[PDB]
Amino acid sequence: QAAMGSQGNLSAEVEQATRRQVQGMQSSQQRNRERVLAQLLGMVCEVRPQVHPNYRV
Amino acid sequence: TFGYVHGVSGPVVTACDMAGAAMYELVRVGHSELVGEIIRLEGDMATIQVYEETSGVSVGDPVLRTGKPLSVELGPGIMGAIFDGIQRPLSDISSQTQSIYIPRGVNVSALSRDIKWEFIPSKNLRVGSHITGGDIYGIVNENSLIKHKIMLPPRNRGSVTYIAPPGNYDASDVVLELEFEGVKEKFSMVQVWPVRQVRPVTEKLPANHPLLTGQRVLDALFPCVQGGTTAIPGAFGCGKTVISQSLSKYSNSDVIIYVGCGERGNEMSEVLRDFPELTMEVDGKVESIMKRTALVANTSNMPVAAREASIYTGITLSEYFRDMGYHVSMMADSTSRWAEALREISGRLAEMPADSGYPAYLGARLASFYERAGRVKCLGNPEREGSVSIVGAVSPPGGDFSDPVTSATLGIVQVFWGLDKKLAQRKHFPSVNWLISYSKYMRALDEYYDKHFTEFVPLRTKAKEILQEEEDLAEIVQLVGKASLAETDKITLEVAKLIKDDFLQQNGYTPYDRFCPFYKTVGMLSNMISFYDMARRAVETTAQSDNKITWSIIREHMGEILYKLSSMKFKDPVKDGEAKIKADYAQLLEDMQNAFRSLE
Amino acid sequence: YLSQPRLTYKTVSGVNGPLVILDHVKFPRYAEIVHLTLPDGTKRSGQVLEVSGSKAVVQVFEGTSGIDAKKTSCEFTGDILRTPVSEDMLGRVFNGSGKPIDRGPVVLAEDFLDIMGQPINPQCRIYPEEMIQTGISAIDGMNSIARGQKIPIFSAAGLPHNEIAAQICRQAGLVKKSEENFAIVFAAMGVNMETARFFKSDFEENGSMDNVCLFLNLANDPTIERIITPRLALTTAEFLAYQCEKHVLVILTDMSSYAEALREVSAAREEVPGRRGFPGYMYTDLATIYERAGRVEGRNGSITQIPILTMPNDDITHPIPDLTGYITEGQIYVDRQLHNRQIYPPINVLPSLSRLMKSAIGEGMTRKDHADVSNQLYACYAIGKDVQAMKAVVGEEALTSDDLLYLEFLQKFEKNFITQGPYENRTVYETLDIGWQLLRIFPKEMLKRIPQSTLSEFYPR
């Protein structure tokens, strides 16, 4: 019985910790996700035509 | 001038549009310009064995052609460096990349073109005098141990027009120039030489000098000549590579060349870590043995076909130093890996296997590879005298000795040594079988051994007789329980046990016996044979007349003496001068005599 | 960076066994990876093996089944197989192909590395000489395993090799005495799931699941992905060693299944056979699996391998044990006879051998009398076995005092030295003392493998 009580206590503690880290990760995301998706759009905009390197006629 | 890829299958690449082709002509393939060699041609098509793993070549890739076959570079700076199968100096790559990986097919020069070296002229050659190919004209000092010598390459002669004066010059700096018909042609200190072509010689010569062997065994029992051929087949576990290390470490030769065929980089790790530590002197100052050794590393992770090349480059290097007028002992490790690689290139090229899956021409190839050896007379006015010996290592497929490769190596070689699994299981280092092993050079060395030592034959004959008698009586005593045995049998088997556990057993890693000289070995064997003979005559006479000397009572009398005869190997010759050693041997001999007189 | 739109061809000109041929393929890329869309929609995968002209043979990882020459499609990547690596993968579980098993996500892959890897520069190698603390007397003292080495264990069916693996991964340490820990890596090779469950449970018993990179593969799964799994695990080990400065205890299991799968692939490809019908390049393949280990300059990390294997029919000359012995330095060879004698840990001490005594032991590391003690013990055990064989027929009456002494020494050796138990970690010093106590039965005279100085120094106690 004491073991299950302590297990509940520790589960609550680690749940609080995990929520704290979740807050940290979402803060890290919102820091620069806009610049990141801007970089993604800059990348996908390119086309760069190129024939196959060693094709010969 | 160029070709395009058509297909690939691991280490082989079929190509197209390559009508201008010749087998054994170097080539380059892909955007990584991996080096290769033509092996098959038909129509405009061809095939190339590639010396680098081929994940990264697709169809249609360029195929550049050159006009020269596989070749290597000879000159100063080679000594003390490490090379791979196709002659890349590992130090230069590690410096250039500053990384711990091999990039696929790097184009580095074999010999650095940025280090200057002092040069000495011939002192007897003047502008206008005539010279023939094979004549030394310059001396460069690679290090204090070896004075590199350069000679005019073959197929060259005529009267010189200019020689570089004494001074410091690099490889690019032209040094020599000759004309023979009216055409001037320059010559540098580096020599381009095809690998598959034998270097010409003047004439062949027999063996006269013994090749030094560190172990007491394989020197007083199964010796090898300085210039002969040896084989060391042995199953796994024994790790005969350590025997190869012992051979390279200590030897009366001048230059030692080790090559690797599909072993682990750890073997390299021991040898490279240890050789700088080891040091020895000959005529004065002491120098590390790394200055007198060259390495050709090739681990199994390397490409398959590269191994054949590696062996061929090894024999080429040893041949060049043979022309130098020296003695060079090489030991090649795991030739079975070469045989497997040849099997694999053939099987991928889809020929018809002859025996055990291996090709139909392994025997001739191995015979030709071993044939490049012997003691010969060089071709030059300074009239050098060169010599080369080979120590090939065989890896039985599972310890079975009926494999075709083992039979071929036995049929070609002159000296054969045996390794037994149970002896290595005994921790009986080294595991010489002394039953199937034989040599064919004792007769040639008899002249030397008589001229210089004047007593080895009775010792050898009696030792062989004792070993044969013990081998005969082993299973006999097993199957009769040592019950009805004469005293002669007991003395024979126990002295044989003494010879086995003292004279044959030799831990080459304990400091006091890392190396043993010939004089100490013959002293040991003299002491043992004298003990055996005196015991034999004593027991014979006493049994004949009365009061038979059984083994138990003589053993009680001489337990102390046989204990000293067992512990006498504890000498440490580096800490013990030869004079003191022979004095102690005479002292033990007279002790044994005194005890035998005390009995009778 | 590859800005090239992908391709897909439907020209399937045939199927034979686990192989598929694609005609009209444009500019094949050798050693490629392709994906296959079955008509019902199931996904499949493979790698291109051979290319010639406008044809491309391709082997399928999960096996040929249901493929239709007119309906299926195949699309081309243009790059060799590259696997996702990640340091956060520790504490996770995946199948052979790498997909999650525990309802975990697609791993966020710190880099993409070559599955085939790359060799290591020779000159960029440093020899390892640090002795590992295993806690087994038969290893520490006799066949001591050092860092940067790859000793396997030769075991047969029914032997307790799994418990030996458990002990060696649990009681790992350092003989030379900050904190230490070993990043376990393990991949199954089609073994029955009961052993997998036992290993999982023991790994929670260790209490460090956060350092357990685990992979799985069961017998019922397709056979041919077993060719891929160990290479992926080794790539992970490379990433965790030479990029994160960590020590990794890589361990495998059941290489016989790997050999069998490679054999089946080779038979499908009708290459030139060898001994017992095995492939010729099985040796080079095993070399690419094993020689990826050690430690290099500029890095404090290291790679240790324990690739335990099955040993059919208990035959030492069977090709797989032979070739594994050649490619490696050491061996253990757990014994069936000892396990039938009801003794644990049942490791035969004689056939075992370790080649790292040359630098792992000696003065300044453990002692100035380790090597001669071990040599004397080996010699005494071997001669004890020989006199036991002699006694098996001759009878005790005709023997001598030396024979009885050797038999008693053998009895003491087996009852005390080998008997170690399941959870009793023992130090090097205790094993040396135990060996000296065992050796004390013989008087000093007959000890022919000890120098005079050490014998005078240590024996009289």
Please report the DSSP string for B308-371 in residue order: HHHHHHHHHHHHHHHHTSSEEEEEE--HHHHHHHHHHHHHHHT----BTTB-S-HHHHHHHHHH
Q: Which residues of B touch C50 (CB under 8 A)?
A: 7-9
Cβ–Cβ < 8 Å for B85, B298: yes
**Where do the domains of chain C lie?**
1-461
Which of B351, B357, B363 lies closest to B47, judged by CA?
A: B351
Helix (H) or strand (E) holding C45: strand C43-52
B46 forms beta bridges with B15, B41
Q: Who's near C378: CB < 8 A, 6+ residues apart?
A: B427, C142, C349, C350
CA distance C82 to B96: 27
Q: Who's near C388: CB < 8 A, 6+ residues apart?
A: C407, C410
CA distance C127 to C350: 26
The answer to whether the annotation marks B481 as part of a ligand binding site is: no
CA distance B121 to B134: 16
CA distance C4 to chain A (A): 9
The answer to whether the annotation marks B234 as part of a ligand binding site is: yes
CA distance B500 to C186: 47
Task: Read off the tokens for C63.
Answer: 């096996």
The residue type at C282:
M
Task: Read off the tokens for B486.
Answer: 């004469």
Q: Which residues of A touch C4 (CB under 8 A)?
A: 50
**Is B584 buried (19+), middle (13-18) or exposed (0-12) by CB count in 10 A?**
middle
Taking CA atoms, what residue in B is nearest to A57? B60
Could you give the strand order of the β-sheet that contains C302-307, starting from the edge strand earlier in sequence?
A: C93-94, C212-215, C183-187, C247-252, C302-307
How many Cα atoms occupy the beta-carbon half-sphere of B101 within 13 Å?
8
Cβ–Cβ < 8 Å for B251, B324: no
CA distance A48 to B185: 53
Which of B157, B1, B120 lies closest to B66, judged by CA?
A: B1
Supply the Cα-derived Rg of chain B in whole angstroms: 29
Q: Which residues of B touch A57 (CB under 8 A)?
A: none
In Å, what is the CA distance from B70 to each residue of B24, B27, B299? Answer: 7, 9, 21
CA distance B148 to B77: 9
- Which residue numbers of A have CB closer than 8 Å to C's CBs? 46-48, 50, 52
- In chain A, how long is the greatest CA-to-CA distance? 83
CA distance B347 to C367: 53
Cβ–Cβ < 8 Å for C152, C189: no
Quick one: CA dihedral B584, B587, B591, B596, positive or negative? positive
Cβ–Cβ < 8 Å for C328, B239: no
Cβ–Cβ < 8 Å for C99, C326: no
The answer to whether the annotation marks C355 as part of a ligand binding site is: yes
Residues recorded for chain B: 600
User: Across the interface, do A52 and C27 touch by the CB < 8 Å criterion?
Assistant: yes
User: Across the interface, do A55 and B61 touch by the CB < 8 Å criterion?
Assistant: no
Q: CB count, 10 Å around CB of C225? A: 21
The residue type at B59:
V
Q: Which of C3, C4, C27 sits opposite A46 (nearest CB)?
A: C3
Phi/psi at B410 (5° precision): -65, -40
**What's this structure's resolution in Å?**
4.3
Taking CA atoms, what residue in C is nearest to B236? C326
CA distance A47 to B301: 40
In Å, what is the CA distance from C392 to each residue of B125, B215, C385? Answer: 82, 37, 10
Q: Which residues of C touch A46 (CB under 8 A)?
A: 3
Q: Which residues of B touch C116 (CB under 8 A)?
A: 53, 55
The answer to whether the annotation marks B411 as part of a ligand binding site is: no
B62 forms beta bridges with B4
Across C289-424, the runs of DSSP E, i.e. the strands, are 302-307, 309-310
Neighbours of chain C (3+ CB pairs under 8 A): A, B
CA distance B249 to B260: 16
Helix (H) or strand (E) holding B293: strand B293-296
User: Across the interface, do B427 and C124 touch by the CB < 8 Å criterion?
Assistant: no
Cβ–Cβ < 8 Å for B445, B210: yes
User: Across the interface, do B62 and A54 touch by the CB < 8 Å criterion?
Assistant: yes
User: Across the interface, do B4 and A56 touch by the CB < 8 Å criterion?
Assistant: yes
Cβ–Cβ < 8 Å for C258, C189: yes
Question: In terms of DSSP bridges, do strands C302-307 and C132-133 run parallel, antiparallel, or are they unpaired?
Answer: unpaired
User: Across the interface, do C53 and B353 touch by the CB < 8 Å criterion?
Assistant: no
3-class secondary-structure state, position C197: helix
Mutate to test the interface with B, among A51, A52, A54 (most CBs of B within 10 A): A54
Q: Which of C272, C283, C398 sits opposite B357 (nearest CB)?
A: C272
- Burial B556-580, CB ≥16 within 10 A → b, else e: eebeebbeebeebbebebeeeeeee
Which of C236, C248, C242, C237 lies closest to C126, judged by CA?
A: C242
DSSP C21: E
Which of B502, B496, B494 lies closest to B520, judged by CA?
A: B502
Q: Which residues of C touch B55 (CB under 8 A)?
A: 30-31, 80, 116
CA distance C87 to C110: 8
Task: Read off the tokens for B49.
Answer: 């064995």
- Method by which this entry was solved: cryo-EM
Task: Read off the tokens for A1.
Answer: 């019985």
CA distance C151 to chain A (A): 41
Query: For the domain C1-461, what is the CATH code?
Result: 3.40.50.12240
Residues recorded for chain A: 57
